[PDB]
Amino acid sequence: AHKSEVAHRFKDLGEENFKALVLIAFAQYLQQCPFEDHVKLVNEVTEFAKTCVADESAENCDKSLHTLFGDKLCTVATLRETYGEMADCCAKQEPERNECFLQHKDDNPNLPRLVRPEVDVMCTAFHDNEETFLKKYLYEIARRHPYFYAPELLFFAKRYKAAFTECCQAADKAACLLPKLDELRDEGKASSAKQRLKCASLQKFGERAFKAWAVARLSQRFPKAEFAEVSKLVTDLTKVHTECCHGDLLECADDRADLAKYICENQDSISSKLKECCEKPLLEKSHCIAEVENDEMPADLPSLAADFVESKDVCKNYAEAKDVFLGMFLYEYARRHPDYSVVLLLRLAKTYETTLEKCCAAADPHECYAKVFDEFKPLVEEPQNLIKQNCELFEQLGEYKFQNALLVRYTKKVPQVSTPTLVEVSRNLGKVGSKCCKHPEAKRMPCAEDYLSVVLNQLCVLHEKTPVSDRVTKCCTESLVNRRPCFSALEVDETYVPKEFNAETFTFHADICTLSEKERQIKKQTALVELVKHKPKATKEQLKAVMDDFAAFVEKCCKADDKETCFAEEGKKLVAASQAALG
Numbered sequence: 001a002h003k004s005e006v007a008h009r010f011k012d013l014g015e016e017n018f019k020a021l022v023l024i025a026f027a028q029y030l031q032q033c034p035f036e037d038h039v040k041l042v043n044e045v046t047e048f049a050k051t052c053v054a055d056e057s058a059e060n061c062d063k064s065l066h067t068l069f070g071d072k073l074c075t076v077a078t079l080r081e082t083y084g085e086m087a088d089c090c091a092k093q094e095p096e097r098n099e100c101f102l103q104h105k106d107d108n109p110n111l112p113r114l115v116r117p118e119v120d121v122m123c124t125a126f127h128d129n130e131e132t133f134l135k136k137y138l139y140e141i142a143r144r145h146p147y148f149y150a151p152e153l154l155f156f157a158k159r160y161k162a163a164f165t166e167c168c169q170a171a172d173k174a175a176c177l178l179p180k181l182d183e184l185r186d187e188g189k190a191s192s193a194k195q196r197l198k199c200a201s202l203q204k205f206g207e208r209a210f211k212a213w214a215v216a217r218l219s220q221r222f223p224k225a226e227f228a229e230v231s232k233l234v235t236d237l238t239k240v241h242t243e244c245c246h247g248d249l250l251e252c253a254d255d256r257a258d259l260a261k262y263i264c265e266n267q268d269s270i271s272s273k274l275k276e277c278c279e280k281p282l283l284e285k286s287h288c289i290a291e292v293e294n295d296e297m298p299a300d301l302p303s304l305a306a307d308f309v310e311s312k313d314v315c316k317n318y319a320e321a322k323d324v325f326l327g328m329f330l331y332e333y334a335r336r337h338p339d340y341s342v343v344l345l346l347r348l349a350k351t352y353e354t355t356l357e358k359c360c361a362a363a364d365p366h367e368c369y370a371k372v373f374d375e376f377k378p379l380v381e382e383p384q385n386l387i388k389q390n391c392e393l394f395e396q397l398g399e400y401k402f403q404n405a406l407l408v409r410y411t412k413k414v415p416q417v418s419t420p421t422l423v424e425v426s427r428n429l430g431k432v433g434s435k436c437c438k439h440p441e442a443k444r445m446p447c448a449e450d451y452l453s454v455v456l457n458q459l460c461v462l463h464e465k466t467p468v469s470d471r472v473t474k475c476c477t478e479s480l481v482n483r484r485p486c487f488s489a490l491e492v493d494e495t496y497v498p499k500e501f502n503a504e505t506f507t508f509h510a511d512i513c514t515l516s517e518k519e520r521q522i523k524k525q526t527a528l529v530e531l532v533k534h535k536p537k538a539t540k541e542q543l544k545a546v547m548d549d550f551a552a553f554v555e556k557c558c559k560a561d562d563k564e565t566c567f568a569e570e571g572k573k574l575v576a577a578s579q580a581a582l583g
Helices: 005-013 015-029 035-054 065-074 084-091 094-103 119-128 130-144 150-167 173-205 207-221 227-246 249-265 282-291 314-320 322-335 342-359 365-371 373-395 399-413 419-435 441-463 470-477 480-488 517-534 540-558 569-581
Strands: none
Touching: 005 015, 005 035, 005 065, 005 249, 005 282, 015 035, 015 065, 015 130, 015 150, 015 249, 035 065, 035 130, 065 084, 065 094, 065 249, 084 094, 119 130, 119 150, 119 173, 130 150, 150 173, 150 249, 150 282, 173 207, 173 227, 173 441, 207 227, 207 322, 207 342, 227 249, 227 322, 249 282, 314 322, 314 342, 314 365, 322 342, 342 365, 342 373, 342 441, 342 480, 365 373, 373 399, 373 419, 373 441, 373 480, 399 419, 399 517, 419 441, 419 517, 441 470, 441 480, 470 480, 517 540, 540 569
């Protein structure tokens, strides 16, 4: 119903969420306009929306959200001066005008990173004006991260509100506040990385791959839901993911809202863990559903071998409808293993597809595919053993020394990769090792998948356009199902000749006593990468000897009376002893 859809969205979302979502909407397009302009546009759009709420038959209220939003974007006069060619969009009709506006979003806005005010200033301006504060930084976060989902930005903003409300009262407001802002910022950039990874992977591998990912992930999340329900949810879900990935905020938010509406209307045919979250306001429903735990799988489900190995009608049931039959295979195999990563379920599904395409063209098919489940055991066991031994080594070593061990191991594997890339991916692998290994084994692999795909994604981004290793290029250009086992099968580059001895490479100053712990560990790890690159044959014991020579150097030189030059005179003998100990 509703003659005015903007009136229904205002009545359904609420004035707070409406004004905030419009703030993100204008902020993502007009990244260069100041905050006051966006406040004016949001207040005017909200007031007109109130005129449509009081009466649906008011003038221009029957027009869609895209028309009013586009015209409102065209109301500004300095559009051609500031954004130039984006003002040419207003000369087009609304359907193409939304595409012009959507393409003229500056993905690289070149905006300076935020200058964080003092803690007392943020708590002061917070207590004096919470609304203008949270909407101010909501605008600053929105205009620096285009194509970021706006409701998720709202939940981020409310988590910021919780952190400020908790830490503006602590004994040490700083030690409480800064770590929480750092974790909300890391969660924001990491979530943005997962969004861009899912969208670029949708553009790179197509739609069918995402449909398989959605059947597997939803079948893990909703094991009691029937296969047809999962099919409807992956059609709607591939719709919302395609439209959200294209960048259109209206189709995105409206689509996810209606999808949450449908799911909460069909809880009984989906899951039982949706009870306490379908009572929430509409904008929070889709978020909780995105964060809801896995439903309990049905009690004693039979083995798939009866319907996918033992049945005589395998090749004809498959050949009659391949994507539907393989969809049922992926549903049944996914509902039984919530502890598996989705990419693993796609590896087993693609293995089954390959074995069926090989057997259904042979002499006796049943004799051929009678051992298809045997091919699944190593493909499952290898990542299991990987997270086992890695979570054991981290669990017995701590995050920093874990990053050092991964640093020297991966430096031995791919020495030609640049040092900042190795340090970055190794530290990120230590952080995911610190986030996912804390869970029990039945929940480690999904977390480690969702973050490992991100880390390796950044790796292939840094290696793109600046290639140094042909094997890294190979694994980065493999199929997404083979990307992880390709990297896990990296060997030690024996043909690597040791790097030059560069005097400026191993040069330190007294400022390292004043550089932050993060940057000090950055310097130690960078000197570690350059140390293993300078000597790829140096054993772990010798590398520990230079580790403790530099560690006792900065330790017994930072804490060694009033000495500014014990980094200059002793650095020479540490350099010479470093060249000798690894000769």
